[PDB]
Amino acid sequence: AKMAFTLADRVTEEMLADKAALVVEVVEENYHDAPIVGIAVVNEHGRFFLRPETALADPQFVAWLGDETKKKSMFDSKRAAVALKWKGIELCGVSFDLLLAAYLLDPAQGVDDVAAAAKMKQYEAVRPDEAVYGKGAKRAVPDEPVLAEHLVRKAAAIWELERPFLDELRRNEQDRLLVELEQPLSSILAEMEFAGVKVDTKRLEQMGKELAEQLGTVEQRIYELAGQEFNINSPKQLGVILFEKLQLPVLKKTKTGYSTSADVLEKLAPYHEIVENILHYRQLGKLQSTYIEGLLKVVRPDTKKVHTIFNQALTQTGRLSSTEPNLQNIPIRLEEGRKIRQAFVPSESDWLIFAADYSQIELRVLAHIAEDDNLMEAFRRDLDIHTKTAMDIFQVSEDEVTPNMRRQAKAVNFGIVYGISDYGLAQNLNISRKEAAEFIERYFESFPGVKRYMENIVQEAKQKGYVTTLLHRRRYLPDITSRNFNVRSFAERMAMNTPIQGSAADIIKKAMIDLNARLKEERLQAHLLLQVHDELILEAPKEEMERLCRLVPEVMEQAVTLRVPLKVDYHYGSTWYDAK
DNA sequence: GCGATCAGCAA
DNA sequence: CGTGCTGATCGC
Ligand SMILES: OC[C@H]1O[C@@](CO)(O[C@H]2O[C@H](CO)[C@@H](O)[C@H](O)[C@H]2O)[C@@H](O)[C@@H]1O
């Protein structure tokens, strides 16, 4: 049942038609400066396989790749675009990306290869990538005959599936979401990843040295207090020392033993001096292992840059994720960890880091969608939302809001932004589930529009089977009808929350597209480096800061027009740490 | 080697 | 009893 195709030794004119399904295969998970193992082209003239060395050296093929008027349909075009950028080759004209199309149709499917996307439309004349390349240590590129047939079958699937996928997207009112938002964003993320972020490795190595010393000191103190040496990083061995040898009370249990999480340890500190030391050890160790050694492992020795990969087709909220390295969770809340950011510096001499972030975009989105009079007024006055929330739920005047009250209201707001349960809020505030539920009840009394929205969206999710965001992103919630309380409750919370987090994701994605267009019109050298959910990090010549102070916030604030204003704060400095 | 476990970081 | 990511430990 083999598929017919030409194993070309050279490029020909019919291979350069104005429309084609194109496969530029990069097997390595991390595609930065990675090998392209094969190329496949399927168009009106037939199916072809090309060896990279040949195609990529052919002037006509390269010109075809870079010609925006020659339309290509692909799967994960960002992967191909970046691998080509490392080879100094520009990829243009990608009018359809099957990975992004599948992602928008149903992000829950977890489509990660052509075969998975194809199976959505009952097309199975293509093998999963894992079946062809294997996994782990067994991972390997097969012989040419096997490789060629696979790439051709993937190209063939893309060629056949474009129409049905576009048709369904159109029915879902998601055609513009793909063509005007996700696909243009894919090219921007490609530029960001390729640019990378410069790292001051010397600074990082010096911090590591200092941490190594502090860890050694705390480590010995721990053994001294424990009366014996053991593996501190082993919750198992640690649990024995704490709850058996030292007899500390067991306040929480894990699936396999005693809980030793920070929240638990904090409660045990008063009982024994070893506890504070364990917490200190955990803090230093986390910075050392994850943020010092971890970062140093992925920095490119020649340029001293790290090149993350943004996964644009994973979350059911529409948010982006970051890997190898993950640059969306670099420490900032605790000063010792925050210092790690001093190691992230501008890539050019006399350039600076510029960071802009939306102020409470999620709650502003909620005010808009729920049309809650109180919440909308709060943002129209640009009030400190935590103080305002405290005033309302605790029924007091602004001057009567104490620090503890604001902290708890802030936690309630966090819970609303991330859609946590009463149990989750209770754990975050170290209170009972009942008291946490009471806080939520008071919040609904103060913001009846939000309560009405939460009730209505849950009913809508049950009726339609899904919920949608501002720009029509969709999330199916089959568990909304489950007779299992916990399972159904999570689905209900996601029905309430996805439109909030998801719309915020839509907005910043559009802002990135609008920003790049403006930077180009203005002829600025400034460029995006990272996205951290509601923040955008750029670098630019020091001479462009003043213009950026006005341009970036404006473009981000005007990305969409809501019933309440959008507000963006910004800072810049010599390092990411200083961009505060 | 590799998956399960537990831990902790960010918006 | 939000998510996604990475790292240390540990049994098969
Ligand atoms: O010196 C290494 C040796 O010490 C043990 C404890 O007996 O573990 C310590 O060192 C590890 C590496 O720094 C940490 O992960 C661990 O938390 C700390 O207690 C042994 O496991 C190890 O062989």
Check whether residue A83 and residue A203 sit in a common domain. Answer: no
What residue owns the CA closest to ligand 1's atom 19?
Answer: A231
Q: Residue A446 belongs to a domain with what CATH number?
A: 1.10.150.20
Residues 6+ apart with CB under 8 A from A28: A34, A35
DSSP labels for A259-282?
Answer: ---HHHHHHHGGG-HHHHHHHHHH
**φ, ψ dihedrals at A568, nearest 5°:** -125, 130
Among the residues of A287-327, which ranges form H helices?
A: 294-298
Angle made by CA atoms A512, A516, A517, in degrees to the nearest 5: 115
Residues 6+ apart with CB under 8 A from A122: none
Check whether residue A35 and residue A170 sit in a common domain. Answer: yes
Residue A42 CB neighbours (<10 A): 26
Check whether residue A487 and residue A522 sit in a common domain. Answer: no
Check whether residue A532 and residue A421 sit in a common domain. Answer: no
Alpha carbon distance A126, A143 (integer Å): 17
Burial class of residue A142 in the structure, from the number of CB atoms within 10 Å of its CB (0-12 exposed, 13-18 middle, 19+ buried): middle
Among the residues of A67-143, which ranges form H helices?
A: 77-85, 98-105, 114-119, 129-133
Alpha carbon distance A317, A467 (integer Å): 11
Q: Give yes or no for residue A233 CB within 6 A of ligand 1.
A: yes
For residue A523, CA distances in Å to A125, A128, A517 come to: 48, 44, 10
Residue A444 CB neighbours (<10 A): 15
Alpha carbon distance A80, A294 (integer Å): 26
Query: CA of A136 and C1' of B1: distance in angstroms?
Result: 9
Residues 6+ apart with CB under 8 A from A100: A178, A182, A183, A186, A312, A313
Check whether residue A213 and residue A76 sit in a common domain. Answer: no
Total number of domains in chain A: 4
Q: Residue A346 belongs to a domain with what CATH number?
A: 3.30.70.370
Distance of CA A164 to the CA centre of its chain: 28
Examine the fold and report which residue of A248, A281, A309 is the final residue of a domain before the chain moves on: A309
Q: Which nucleotide is nearest to A254 (CA to C1')?
A: B6
Alpha carbon distance A7, A149 (integer Å): 9
**Residue from A218, A229, A231 to probe ligand 1 pocket by mutation (most atoms less than 8 Å from CB):** A231
> Could you tell me the distance, in angstroms and rounded to a whole number, from the CA of residue A232 to the centre of ligand 1?
7
Alpha carbon distance A517, A535 (integer Å): 18
Q: Give yes or no for residue A231 CB within 6 A of ligand 1.
A: yes
Cβ contact A345:A529 at 8 Å = no
Burial class of residue A520 in the structure, from the number of CB atoms within 10 Å of its CB (0-12 exposed, 13-18 middle, 19+ buried): exposed
Examine the fold and report which residue of A478, A504, A530 is the final residue of a domain before the chain moves on: A504
Distance of CA A47 to the CA centre of its chain: 36
Check whether residue A49 and residue A179 sit in a common domain. Answer: yes
For residue A271, CA distances in Å to A237, A249, A264 come to: 19, 9, 12
Examine the fold and report which residue of A309, A337, A369 is the final residue of a domain before the chain moves on: A309
DSSP labels for A449-509?
Answer: HHHHHHHHHHHHHHHHSEEE-TT--EEE-GGGG-SSHHHHHHHHHHHHHHHHHHHHHHHHH
* Beta-strand pair A351-358/A309-311: unpaired
Q: Which nucleotide is nearest to A422 (CA to C1')?
A: C1
> Own/partner pairs for A537-540, CB < 8 Å, 24+ apart?
A537/A353, A537/A354, A537/A355, A537/A576, A537/A579, A538/A353, A538/A354, A538/A355, A538/A356, A539/A346, A539/A347, A539/A348, A539/A351, A539/A352, A539/A353, A539/A354, A540/A351, A540/A352, A540/A354
Candidates A165, A273, A188, A181; CA nearest to A222 is: A273
Residues 6+ apart with CB under 8 A from A483: none
Query: CA of A261 and C1' of B6: distance in angstroms?
Result: 8
Check whether residue A281 and residue A247 sit in a common domain. Answer: yes
Check whether residue A322 and residue A351 sit in a common domain. Answer: yes
**To which residue do tokens 């913001």 refer?**
A447
Q: Which nucleotide is nearest to A287 (CA to C1')?
A: B9
Angle made by CA atoms A18, A20, A25, in degrees to the nearest 5: 130
Instruction: Using a 7 Å cut-off to protein CB atoms, list the covered nucleotides of chain B.
Output: 1-3, 5-11
Cβ contact A316:A106 at 8 Å = no
Alpha carbon distance A299, A301 (integer Å): 6
| Strand B neighbours among A 210-239, CB < 7 A | 235
Check whether residue A101 and residue A173 sit in a common domain. Answer: yes
Alpha carbon distance A484, A176 (integer Å): 37
Which two three-digit tokens encode residue A453?
Answer: 């929205």
**φ, ψ dihedrals at A525, nearest 5°:** -85, -15
For residue A148, CA distances in Å to A41, A51, A368 come to: 11, 9, 52
- Which ligand 1 atom sits nearest the alpha carbon of residue A234? 17
**φ, ψ dihedrals at A376, nearest 5°:** -65, -40
CB-hemisphere CA count at 13 Å for A463? Answer: 7
Q: Residue A250 belongs to a domain with what CATH number?
A: 1.20.1060.10
Q: What is the resolution of this structure in A?
A: 1.7
For residue A459, CA distances in Å to A206, A466, A523 come to: 56, 10, 49
3-state helix, strand, coil in chain A (%, to 5): 55, 15, 30
Which two three-digit tokens encode residue A96?
Answer: 């359809």
**φ, ψ dihedrals at A305, nearest 5°:** -110, 155
Check whether residue A381 and residue A424 sit in a common domain. Answer: yes
Q: Give yes or no for residue A220 CB within 6 A of ligand 1.
A: no
Among the residues of A302-360, which ranges form H helices?
A: 335-338
Check whether residue A190 and residue A284 sit in a common domain. Answer: no
What residue owns the CA closest to ligand 1's atom 23?
Answer: A231
DSSP labels for A58-77?
Answer: -HHHHHHHH-TTSEEEESSH
3 state DSSP class of A355: strand
Among the residues of A292-372, which ranges form H helices?
A: 294-298, 335-338, 361-370
> Could you tell me the distance, in angstroms and rounded to a whole number, from the CA of residue A236 to the centre of ligand 1?
14
Cβ contact A272:A225 at 8 Å = yes
Check whether residue A518 and residue A453 sit in a common domain. Answer: no
Q: Residue A160 belongs to a domain with what CATH number?
A: 3.30.420.10
Question: The domain containing residue A553 runs over which residues?
Answer: 310-360+505-579
> Could you tell me the distance, in angstroms and rounded to a whole number, from the CA of residue A272 to the centre of ligand 1?
22
Q: Which nucleotide is nearest to A314 (CA to C1')?
A: C4
Residue A91 CB neighbours (<10 A): 22
